[PDB]
Symmetry: C2
Subunit: 82 residues, 2 copies
């Protein structure tokens, strides 16, 4: 019965080696995807900070532009009435 | 012995079942992590788009502000010469 026992043990050890190597490859892929997520989240939060500062500057610039538009129209009124 | 052959046959059925279950579990976990990376990447991209749009508006409105200020000064000058 030695050959049958050897054949079954061979199959069991094949499966154990396959399992160990599949686990190693899976751990590598999981770590890669986890770090990808952490880094995309950091890029996102950083851009969010930049966009907040740009929005602040745009609010102030929009207000300044609007006031100069207003004042030009008033100056042109005075030119007409003159 | 029949006890050793049947023990190995039983262990083999269990290990093959575990291999199939693990392959599906690994695929599910990777799929979940890949979706997380896609979610975070879309969040990052949307912020990048907003930042680009803000930078565009800032350039357009600085041009407009500066021109209006020049034309306000010139309209005031014309009124003094009127």
């Amino acid at each position: 019965m030695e050959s049958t026992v050897n054949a079954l043990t061979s199959e069991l050890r094949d499966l154990r080696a396959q399992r160990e190597e599949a686990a190693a490859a899976h751990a590598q892929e999981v770590r890669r995807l986890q770090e990808q997520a952490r880094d995309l989240g950091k890029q996102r939060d950083s851009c969010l900070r930049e966009a907040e500062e740009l929005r602040t500057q745009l609010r102030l610039l929009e207000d300044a532009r609007d006031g100069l538009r207003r004042e030009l129209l008033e100056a042109q009124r005075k030119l007409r009435e003159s």
